[PDB]
Design an enzyme around this catalytic site. Structure first.
Site, mmCIF file in Angstrom:
data_model
loop_
_atom_site.group_PDB
_atom_site.id
_atom_site.type_symbol
_atom_site.label_atom_id
_atom_site.label_comp_id
_atom_site.label_asym_id
_atom_site.label_seq_id
_atom_site.Cartn_x
_atom_site.Cartn_y
_atom_site.Cartn_z
ATOM 1 N N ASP A 35 2.312 -7.828 7.892
ATOM 2 C CA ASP A 35 2.690 -6.466 7.535
ATOM 3 C C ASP A 35 3.694 -5.920 8.540
ATOM 4 O OD1 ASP A 35 2.880 -3.922 6.639
ATOM 5 O OD2 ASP A 35 0.848 -3.330 7.262
ATOM 6 N N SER A 199 20.248 1.937 4.252
ATOM 7 C CA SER A 199 21.003 1.261 3.213
ATOM 8 C C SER A 199 22.235 2.090 2.868
ATOM 9 C CB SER A 199 20.119 1.074 1.978
ATOM 10 O OG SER A 199 20.880 0.590 0.885
HETATM 11 C C1 LIG Z 1 -0.670 -3.166 4.276
HETATM 12 O O1 LIG Z 1 -1.566 -3.801 3.398
HETATM 13 C C2 LIG Z 1 -2.385 -2.976 2.743
HETATM 14 C C3 LIG Z 1 -2.258 -1.590 2.913
HETATM 15 C C4 LIG Z 1 -3.124 -0.751 2.218
HETATM 16 C C5 LIG Z 1 -4.100 -1.272 1.374
HETATM 17 C C6 LIG Z 1 -4.208 -2.635 1.214
HETATM 18 C C7 LIG Z 1 -3.345 -3.505 1.907
HETATM 19 C C8 LIG Z 1 -3.688 -4.923 1.548
HETATM 20 N N1 LIG Z 1 -4.694 -4.840 0.446
HETATM 21 C C9 LIG Z 1 -5.168 -3.425 0.371
#
Ligand SMILES: COc1cccc2c1CNC2
Ligand SMILES: COc1cccc2c1CNC2
EC number: 3.4.23.22
Length: 330
Positions: A35, A199
């Site tokens: 992430d 962008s």
């Molecule tokens: C950043 O990833 C997230 C963020 C929010 C909720 C969820 C995820 C992954 N599955 C549920």
């Protein structure tokens, strides 16, 4: 050093991507959601409330000879959709695709919200935004990339997400066989802790390019592309029968449609998202109304270049002293 790991969509829609990560000694392999929009490495664990685990693979620190409790440390995080998780912290050895960090903060979930419980394919998150966003208290911890950076051949990682197919995260090197043409680099602001960039505009289908600055974040942890309401309205106006539905929570379109592409600017270069990438399928099983992959950012407070956009490009996250982002077609 370098690392290279394959990232795999969790479902037929590319709702998220999971990458195997080795934690502890002997290794415990968990599939984590990398992430670039957050900065905590947290896992389902032997400490997670049992009623909140439903199929995930858990990290058990007591079975790792290199795990050490980080005394007094806790963490607690809330994500853009209102999901959340919290717990305590260990340090342990973490490896991604052959690249090993010792003493990485591994945040062990005691509590997770329902959206995490309900997704049995995601065993935790691995944050790759800037370490200033890490939630560990009272001593903030560094991301995996920050800890590895000095050891890497080059202080970079790359995201090459697939469309309905596996892709790759590389650490420490740029695979010149993975993209076409040249990589266009663009400035990053780290002031909000994100890979925030501007962008240079957009086009809808074969339409003319509109030059306009769109500040947003490169976020592998968000599924869709969230852009200003003017831009999103201009896109969906080219799709017969498309409409914004408050009951569904965004733009929907007839599943019988053929969607136009969407182009975004990176400096003088252009990344083209094919129309098929914007189809997220029926809103509910068997419906002929389909959910759009380009949505308005108006309620969010920030524009988000999520997976829909990033998967159309080879993306360089350059963590040099002055960070930058690079985009190439592929
Ligand atoms: C950043 O990833 C997230 C963020 C929010 C909720 C969820 C995820 C992954 N599955 C549920
Ligand atoms: C509401 O969504 C937001 C808002 C701000 C920052 C981020 C997200 C999702 N990942 C990073």
């Amino acid at each position: 050093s370098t690392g290279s790991a394959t990232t795999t969509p969790i479902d037929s829609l590319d709702d998220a991507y999971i990458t195997p990560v080795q934690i502890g000694t002997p290794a415990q392999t968990l599939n984590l959601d990398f992430d670039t929009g957050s900065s905590d490495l947290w896992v389902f664990s032997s400490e997670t409330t049992a009623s909140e685990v439903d199929g995930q693979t858990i990290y058990t620190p007591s079975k790792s000879t290199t795990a050490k409790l980080l005394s007094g440390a806790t963490w607690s995080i809330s994500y853009g959709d209102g999901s959340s998780s919290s717990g305590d912290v260990y340090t342990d050895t973490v490896s991604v695709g052959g690249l090993t960090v010792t003493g990485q903060a591994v945040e062990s979930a005691k509590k997770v919200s329902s959206s995490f419980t309900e997704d049995s394919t995601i065993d935790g998150l691995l944050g790759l935004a800037f370490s200033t966003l890490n939630t560990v208290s009272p001593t903030q911890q560094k991301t995996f990339f920050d800890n590895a950076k000095a050891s890497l051949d080059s202080p970079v990682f790359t995201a090459d997400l697939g469309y309905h197919a596996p892709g790759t995260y590389n650490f420490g090197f740029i695979d010149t066989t993975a993209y076409t043409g040249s990589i266009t680099y663009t400035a990053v602001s780290t002031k909000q802790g994100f890979w925030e960039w501007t962008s240079t505009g957009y086009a809808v289908g074969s339409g003319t390019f509109k030059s306009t600055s769109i500040d947003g974040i490169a976020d592998t942890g968000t599924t869709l592309l969230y852009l200003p309401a003017t831009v999103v309205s201009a896109y969906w106006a080219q799709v017969s029968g498309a409409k914004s539905s408050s009951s569904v929570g965004g733009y929907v379109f007839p599943c019988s449609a053929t969607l136009p592409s969407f182009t975004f600017g990176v400096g003088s270069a252009r990344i083209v998202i094919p129309g098929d990438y914007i189809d997220f399928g029926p809103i509910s099983t068997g419906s002929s109304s389909c959910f759009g992959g380009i949505q308005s950012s108006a309620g969010i407070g920030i524009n988000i270049f999520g997976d829909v956009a990033l998967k159309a490009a080879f993306v360089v996250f350059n963590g040099a002293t002055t960070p930058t982002l690079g985009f190439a077609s592929k």
